[PDB]
Amino acid sequence: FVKPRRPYNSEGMTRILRRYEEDLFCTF
Amino acid sequence: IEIDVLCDLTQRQAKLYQVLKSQISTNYDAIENAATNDNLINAVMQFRKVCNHPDLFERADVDSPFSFTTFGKTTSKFTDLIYSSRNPIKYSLPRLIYEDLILPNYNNDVDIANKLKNVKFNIFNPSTNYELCLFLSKLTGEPSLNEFFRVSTTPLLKRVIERTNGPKNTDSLSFKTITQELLEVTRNAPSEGVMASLLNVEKHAYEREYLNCIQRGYHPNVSAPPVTIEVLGSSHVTNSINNELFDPLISQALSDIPAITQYNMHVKKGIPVEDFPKTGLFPEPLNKNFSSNISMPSMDRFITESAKLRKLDELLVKLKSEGHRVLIYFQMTKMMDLMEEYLTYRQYNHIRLDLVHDWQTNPEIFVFLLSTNLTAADTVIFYDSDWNPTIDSQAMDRATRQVTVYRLLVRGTIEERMRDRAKQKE
Amino acid sequence: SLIAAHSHITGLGLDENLQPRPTSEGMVGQLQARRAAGVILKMVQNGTIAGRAVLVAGPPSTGKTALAMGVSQSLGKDVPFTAIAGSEIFSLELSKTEALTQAFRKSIGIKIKEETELIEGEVVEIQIDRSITGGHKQGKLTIKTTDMETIYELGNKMIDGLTKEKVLAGDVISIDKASGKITKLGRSFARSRDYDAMGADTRFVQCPEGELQKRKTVVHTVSLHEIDVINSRTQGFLALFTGDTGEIRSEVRDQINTKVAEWKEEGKAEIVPGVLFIDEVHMLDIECFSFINRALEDEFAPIVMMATNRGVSKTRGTNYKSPHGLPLDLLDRSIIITTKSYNEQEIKTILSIRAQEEEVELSSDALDLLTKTGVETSLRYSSNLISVAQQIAMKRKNNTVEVEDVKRAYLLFLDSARSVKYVQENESQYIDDQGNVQISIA
Amino acid sequence: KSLSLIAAHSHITGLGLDENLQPRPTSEGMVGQLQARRAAGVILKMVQNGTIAGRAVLVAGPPSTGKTALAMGVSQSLGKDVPFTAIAGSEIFSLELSKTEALTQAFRKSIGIKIKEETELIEGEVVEIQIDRSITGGHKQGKLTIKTTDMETIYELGNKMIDGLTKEKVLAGDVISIDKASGKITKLGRSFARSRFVQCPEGELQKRKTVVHTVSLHEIDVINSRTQGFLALFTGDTGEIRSEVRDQINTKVAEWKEEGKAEIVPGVLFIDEVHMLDIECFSFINRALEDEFAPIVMMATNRGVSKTRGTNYKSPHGLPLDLLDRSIIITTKSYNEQEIKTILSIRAQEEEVELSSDALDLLTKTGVETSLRYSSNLISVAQQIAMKRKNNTVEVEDVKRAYLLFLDSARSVKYVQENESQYIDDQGNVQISIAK
Amino acid sequence: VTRTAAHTHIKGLGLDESGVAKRVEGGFVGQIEAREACGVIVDLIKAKKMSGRAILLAGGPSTGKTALALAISQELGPKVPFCPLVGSELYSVEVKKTETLMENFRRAIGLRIKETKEVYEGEVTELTPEDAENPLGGYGKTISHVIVGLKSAKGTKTLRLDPTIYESIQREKVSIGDVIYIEANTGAVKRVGRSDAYATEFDLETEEYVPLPKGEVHKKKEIVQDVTLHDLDVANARPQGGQDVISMMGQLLKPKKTEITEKLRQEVNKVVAKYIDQGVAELIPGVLFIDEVNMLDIEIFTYLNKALESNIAPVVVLASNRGMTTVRGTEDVISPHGVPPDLIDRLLIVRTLPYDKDEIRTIIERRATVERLQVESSALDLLATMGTETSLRYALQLLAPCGILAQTSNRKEIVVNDVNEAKLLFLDAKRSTKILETSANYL
Amino acid sequence: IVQDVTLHDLDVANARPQGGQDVISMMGQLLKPKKTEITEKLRQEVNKVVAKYIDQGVAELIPGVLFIDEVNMLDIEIFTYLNKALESNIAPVVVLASNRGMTTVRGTEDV
Ligand SMILES: Nc1ncnc2c1ncn2[C@@H]1O[C@H](COP(=O)(O)OP(=O)(O)O)[C@@H](O)[C@H]1O
Ligand SMILES: Nc1ncnc2c1ncn2[C@@H]1O[C@H](COP(=O)(O)OP(=O)(O)O)[C@@H](O)[C@H]1O
Ligand SMILES: Nc1ncnc2c1ncn2[C@@H]1O[C@H](COP(=O)(O)OP(=O)(O)O)[C@@H](O)[C@H]1O
C-alpha cells in the first residue's frame, strides 16, 4: 500500500499564497 | 557450464590484509600452505576472515571524531539531558589569585582603576571632550553623539551582533564608494540582469559544478571542548565561566527561536517583532553532508567495499531466470551478514534453514543460502575456498537437470595459492 | 577575446603517426621538439604514469612557451593545465613547499559522475509559509503539465531560489535536483491579474508535454585542490575565490586521498591526470627544487613541464653554478627537450602566420624587409612592428602596408642593439650605475 | 611519569651525593665527573636554600661528557614542586614573539608561587537516591542516602542539587565527590558491586583538606594581562605581554609574601646549547639576572673559541666576555676506559637483558675507540640481532655484525673520502654514472 | 590501469626469516647489508620500547635510501604511523620551524583507543518546545525545555532536552519525520535523513531515505579508533567540538598554526597515561622520515639533538645525498653529509652502495614489467649500457616514451629503434650540459 | 543609466562576500580589510561572464593604459612575472619609463 505523505506542521507561521487568478498574503 | 571470474582486492580489504599480514614474523603462513598442512591456525582463520570481507568478522561502526570528554555516563516518564561535556584537563587555580586580582575587593583597586581608565579619561567622552565628538559627528554623519563612546566601550562580538540598520546623516563625509553601490544595487535582484549577474560568480560556480550534491571528504579525528578551569571553594568562578561559555546573547545569536514560540511572543504576549533577540546568524554550511562530522555507515559502502560482493550483486542483477545457491563455507558458516545485505537492499523471495519443496514449485523464490539429491534447483554458485575438489564435487552432487558452475576468485590473496595447487589436481 | 602573442597556435601541428607536418595547426619549425611534445601529450592522454618531469631548453625567442601552449591547446578541454610562473611561489601567507603543493593539487583533476533529476512544468500554486522573523521556511509547490500534476514539498534553498527571480503562478520553470538551479522559461497561462509593479514579463512559452520527472546523469570536473579547500574549513567555498586558504594541514590531504581512491573504486570518480607548466623555472629556489625532486614520487602527481632560457648559471639560494640553473639531482630526474634557433624561411612563415592573425595586408617586399629585420635583430621585434606599421598605414589612408611604413616604424621605435649603442654613445646624459649624471647642456 | 619509553638519560635518578656533598663513585645511575658533580651538588643546595637570586652557571666541556646528564641529574634530584624549564637555543627565535619576550617568558616560567588552600569536600558511596519528582511547578524535592565505611546518612536536597544530579547521572552504589561551594560532583567510579571499579571510601564524610597549589609567575602574568585568558597557556598566543602588568604582578607577589599568604619557590632554567643565541639575547640575559625574581640559570655549551652569532668576532666558549664575567664555570672532563665500561653496564642493565663479559669488553673498546654514544646505540641493535638469532644473551659476534652494519662517524668520513665523485660536493658536482 | 609512482615495484624489504636477504624479493635488487640493517631497524620498531633512536641513510643518488624508507613503511604496516617529510617542509611562514618539527614528531607517535559512546537515535514523531516565562528579558533563553519523541524498533522514549542540546537540534534543521542521531558524549547530533515510513517520492532536496534504526534507543556503542598525539594537541589547542560559544565560534574562524605550549603536551601525556593504566589505550610509536636532511639549517639540528633525548620522541630516519659539504646556516663548519658533528654522535650511519650493470639491467626489467611493457633483450641491454653510461634514473624515465613510440608503430614490442628514437628526442643531463657549453646564445 | 567599472572593481566585489549578513561577513565589514591573493579562478569566471555580456551586445569593454615609472627599480622576479602576464589575453598595454643607462638589474648580481 502506498505510504502516507509526511505530516505538514505549519502552525505558528505567516502564509504566502499565489494562485492562478490572484495572490494572497496571510500575516499576523 | 563452467565460468570463472577473478576480482581485484578492494582498498579497505587490502589495508586490512597488510595490517594483519605484518604481525611480527608471519612468514606468509596461509600461502605457506598451512591450511593445506592441517599459532598457524589462528593466522589462517584471521587471513580468511580478512580476505573474504571486513564486516563478516567486525562491524563497520559509525565514523565520528574521538570524543575527548568526561561527560556523565551510565552503567546501563521522560529521560532528560543536560549538556555536561568537559575536558579531562583540569587547570586548577588558587582562590587567592581570583579573589585578589579579578574580583573587586575593599583592599583591591580593580573597579576604581577600571572606571578611571575607561570613563573619566576616555577621549570620546562628550562631558569632557565635546569638540572631538562633534568632529567625528561631522565626519561619519552619526545621529547620536554618544555613539563613539558606545563603540569604544563594547566587545567586538557584541558590537557585531547589535548591528544598526539606520542610515546616516546626508551631509557627512562618508562618500559611498562604487563597490558599495554595486553591492547594494544587487541586494535583491533577479536573474537576466547585467549588473546582477556580474556580481555573483560564486552562485554560478555553485550551480555549474554541482556543489549541492557533493560528499564530506574529511572529518577531524579528535574533537574537544574548551579546557575546563576548576577553582575550588567559590561559586563566583562557576557563575562566571558558565556565563562566558553560554552567554545568552551570543548563544541566542547563533540560534533560532521556534516558530510557535514566535507566535507566542508576537501575538499572545504582544512583543513587537523588532524587539526579538536576533537569531539566524550562524553561517550556513555548504551542504547537508557538511553539517556534522559524524558519518553514518552507508549500505552502499558495504556493497562496494568487498572484492566479491560487488561482482556478486552484479551477478544476481544479471541472473534472474535461474535460482542459485551459495557455498557459505568460504567464511565457515557466516549466514548473517549476507542475510542483512539482501533483505536490506537487494530484497527477493527467499528461503534459508518442507524447506526443499518450496523452491521447486516456482523459481521466483531462490534456494539462496544453505550450508553443505536436491538438484531440482536451476543452478548453484559454488566458487572457491576449495584446495580439495572432493568437497566441491560432493557439494555439486547435491546441487533442473542442467548444472551451471560460477567460480569467483580474488587475485593477490591465498585463493590464488590454494585454488594454483588444486588447479592441476583437477 | 583579444589577439595576444600566442593567438595563432591552435595545436601541435602533428599527424596521427606522431610525425610533425611542416606547417599546420598554426605552427612551423622545431620538428624534433614538436615530435617530443606530441609524445608527452600522448603520455598525458594515456594517463597512467605519474610524475614525469619534462624540461624544455633553448635560447630566448625560440618557441618554448609556444610549444607548451600548443600542448595545452591540443590537450583538450576538461583536463587541467596550470600555467604558473616561477615568481608566483614566493608568498607572504603560504610556504614555498605549500605553494608548490597547492599547484600540484590544482593540476590534478577528478571527473565526478552524479545522478540528477529534472522537472519541468506549469506552476499551479505556491504555499510558502514563513515564520515571523522569516528565518525558518517551509512550503508546498504544485506543478502540472499537459499529462499529469504532482504536489512537491519545499525546503529552505528551493524557497529562497523561488523568491529571488520571483515566480508566480502561470510560469514554466525547470528545476535540477542535484544542483538546485531554477530556470524560469517563461509565462504560459497569461493570467488576467496584472499588478502595476511587474514591468518585466517573460516571453510566452508553450506549456510542456510528457512526464515531469526525467532521469538524467551528468559529469562535472573538480580538481583536488578545490576538494581540499572545500573540506579544509567551514567556509571553504569562499577561499577558492578570495584565496585566503593557507598552510593546510596534511591530515585533510591524506583523508581526501583515501576518499578519492574510495570514489575511484566504487565508480563515482574517474581521475584524469593533468599538466603543471612552470615557465621560467630557473627563477625558483633550492628548497623548491628539493621539494620538486621529492614531490614527483607520488601517485597524485601530474606531468610537470619546465622551461628555461639560461646557460650554465647560478642556482638561486646557493653559491655554486649549475646547468640551466637546475641542480644535478633534479636534472637527472628530468628528461630534456631541446630547441634550436630559426632560419629565414621559418621566420618568414612566422611573420606570415602572425600577420594573417593580425589582419594586416602586408606587401611582399615589406615582408622581405621584415624578415631581414627579424634575422638581423630578433623575431619579437619584427613581430611587434607589424601592428605599428598597420597603424601608420591607417594614418596615411592606405590599406596595404608598404615599405615606407616599415622604415618609419623602424626609425620611430628602437630595438635592443640600437638602444644599447645610443646609450653607449652619450652615456653622461643617462644616470650611471654609480649614480652620476650631467643634466645640463653646458 | 606520564608515558615514558627508555631514553638516553633514563638511568639518571639524581646526583649520587652523600650528606657532606662528597660524590660516591657510582650512585643513582651516574658515575664519574666527581668535581663537576660536587659543583652541581653545591648549586643544588643553593636552589634548595632559595635565598640567592639570579646566578648563572656555565657547564662547558667536550661533547659527550655528561653536561646534559649533569643537568638532568640536577632536575631529578630537585624533585617536584620546584619549577624546572629546559629550553634550547633554537626555541626563542620566535616568529610571533621577540627574542627578549621569549627569554622573559622562559625566565618567569621558572619562578613559582606556593599557596596553601583549605577547601570542603564530601566523598562517599550512594546507598540510594530518591527524588519526589511531583513537579506541580518548577520545584522538585528528593533525598540522598550516602555511605562510607564509618558513615551512613540521609540528606535533604535542594533544587540545585537535583539539577546537578540529573546530569552526571548517579545511580545507587556509585562513588561521588561533592564540592558544596561550587556544586560540581565527580563520579570517581563504582564500588565493589559486580555480582571502572574503585574502592569504597573510608569514613568521616565532609572532611576538609589542604591542596597545595604551585603556579608559576608566567601563568599569573597571562591571567592578569586582561585580553588573553588562560587559553593562551595552551594555545601559545600570549603575544607580547606588557611590562605594566608584570610590574603589578611583582608588587602583588611582594605583598603576598609580606602578608604571608603565599610563598615563593625559586626554580632552575636550563638552556641547552646556549651558543646559538644572538648577542641581543646575551645582552638581555646580561641585564636580566639583576631582578630579584630571577631563577638560577644553567647554561651548557661545547664550543671552543668561536664566533658569536649576530657579530663577526670570535670569543671564548661562543659567549661574549661580560656574560662570562657574570657566571661561574663548571668544567667537565672526558671519560677513561672504566667509566665507559660502567656507563655501558648501567645502560645495558636497564635497556635490555644481560651481556656476555667479552662482548661488554668489546663494547668498551669500541666506545674508547670511536664514541660512548655510538656504543650505547650499538647495544640495542646487537640485542635485536641476537633475538633474530634466537639467543638470550648478547655475544661478541652480534656486536661484530652490528659493527659491520652500522658505521660510526670516522668510518663514514673515511668512506666518503675514498668515494668522492659519487657524492655531491659544495660546488654541486657529482658523477652519478658508474661507467668511465 | 593502475598508475605507477616510481615505487610501486617495491612491496617490502624482502628478507628471509633469519635476517638474511634474498637477492630477489619485493622488487629489491642488491643492497644486501642495507636491507639487513633496515630489517633490524624494523624489528627494533616492533619492539616498541625505545625512544629517540635515529639513523642516517648515507649514499649517493640513484641508490635507494627513499626506497629503503618506504620499504620500512611497507614492512611495518599501516597500523603503526609513518610520517614522510622533506627538509624544506620545516620552514613555515606562519609559525617557528622548531614547532613544525615537534608537530611532526608528535604526528609520528600513534595511539590505539577503544571508546564507548552513549547514543540516542530514532525517528522524530514528536517535537514540541516549551516557552520561557520572560522572553524579552534576554538573560535566559527563549525556551526552557524541549520534549522530543524518539521512536525506533523495539523501543520508544520521550526526550526532555536542555536548550543547549536544542541549539544543535535546530542547527541540523531537524524536522518531524526524519531519523536523527544524538551523540551524548559531546552533544553533537547528526540528521541522517528522512524516514522511509512516509512517502519518499515527493521531495525536491535529493534527500537520502533511511529505515528505522535497529535496537533500542540509549544504545551504548563501543568503537575502536586510531589517532595521533599531534591530533590530540591540535584538538585541545583549538577547541572545536563543544556546544559552548567558544567552540561554535572556533569552528568558524580560519585556523592558524600556533606555538603549542609544552604544558598542553604534559597534560595530554598525563591523560593518555591514565588511558593506558585504565586499560583502553595502547601506545604505538612510529617512524618519521626526514628526506633531504642537507636542506635543514643549524637551528633544526641544534634543537633536534635535544628533542631526540626525550622520553616520548619517536624513531626518526634520515636521508642525505651529499658528501663533505658545508652546513646550511653557518659558513665555517665543514661536515659530512651536511650534518653537524654534534648530531652525528647520536646518529647510526647506514651506508648504501652504488650499482653494477647487472643490477641496473634487472631493475630496468622489473620496472618495465611493473609498467606493463615487455621489452626485447637487446633493447634491455642497450638501456643497461645507457644506465651505466648516463644514470640509472635516465634509463628508468626513458622506458615510457619508447613504449609510446611502440604504440605509435602499431606493435606491442620495444625494439632498439624505439630506444634510439628516445635518445634522439630526449636528452640526459650530460649531453644537455655539453650543448650548453658549445652554444653561445646562453641556451 | 550607463555605468563604467573596472575589472578590478568586479574582482574585489566578487571576492568579498556580498549579502548573507551572518557573523562572518559582518565581522569582515567591522575589521580591517586584508589584501589577499586573488586566484585565477575568480578572474576566469569574471572574464567569462564579462565576455558573455559583451557577446550579448549590452556591455562595452575599453582597455586603458598603465604607466609604471622608474621601471629600473623592479626586482628580477617582477620582470619574470611580467613576461607571462604581458602574454595574457586581457591585460592592457603598459608604458615603461626609465632614466638610467648601463646598470645592474635589481635583484640579481651581474646582469
Ligand atoms: N614553431 C612556432 N610556431 C608558432 N610561433 C612560434 C614558433 N616558434 C616561435 N614562435 C613565436 O616566437 C615567439 C617566442 O616564443 P615563446 O616561447 O613565447 O618565447 P621564448 O621563445 O622567448 O620563450 C612567440 O611569440 C611565438 O609566437
Ligand atoms: N657520568 C655519567 N653517568 C652516566 N651516564 C653518562 C655520564 N656521562 C654521560 N653519560 C651518558 O652519555 C650519553 C651522552 O652524554 P651527554 O649527556 O650527551 O653528554 P654531553 O651532555 O656532554 O653532551 C647520555 O646518554 C648520558 O646518559
Ligand atoms: N634496491 C633497489 N631495487 C630496485 N629499484 C631501486 C632500488 N634502489 C633504487 N631503485 C630505483 O631507483 C630510483 C631511485 O630511488 P630513490 O631511493 O627514490 O632515489 P635515490 O636512490 O637517489 O635515493 C627509484 O625509482 C627506484 O625505483
Numbering used by the authors:
A (entry chain Z): 293 to 320
B (entry chain Q): 948 to 985, 999 to 1036, 1069 to 1345, 1356 to 1374, 1382 to 1408, 1414 to 1440
C (entry chain W): 18 to 459
D (entry chain U): 15 to 209, 220 to 460
E (entry chain V): 21 to 463
F (entry chain X): 243 to 353
Please share excerpts from the published article on this structure:
Unlike other chromatin remodelers, INO80 preferentially mobilizes hexasomes, which can form during transcription. Here, we report cryogenic-electron microscopy (cryo-EM) structures of endogenously purified S. cerevisiae INO80 bound to a hexasome and a nucleosome. We group subunits of the INO80 complex into four modules: Rvb module (Rvb1/Rvb2), Arp8 module (Arp8/Arp4/Actin/Ies4 and Taf14), Ino80 module (Ino80/Ies2) and Arp5 module (Arp5/Ies6). The Ino80 protein consists of three major regions: the N-terminal domain (NTD), the HSA region (Ino80HSA) and the ATPase domain (Ino80ATPase).
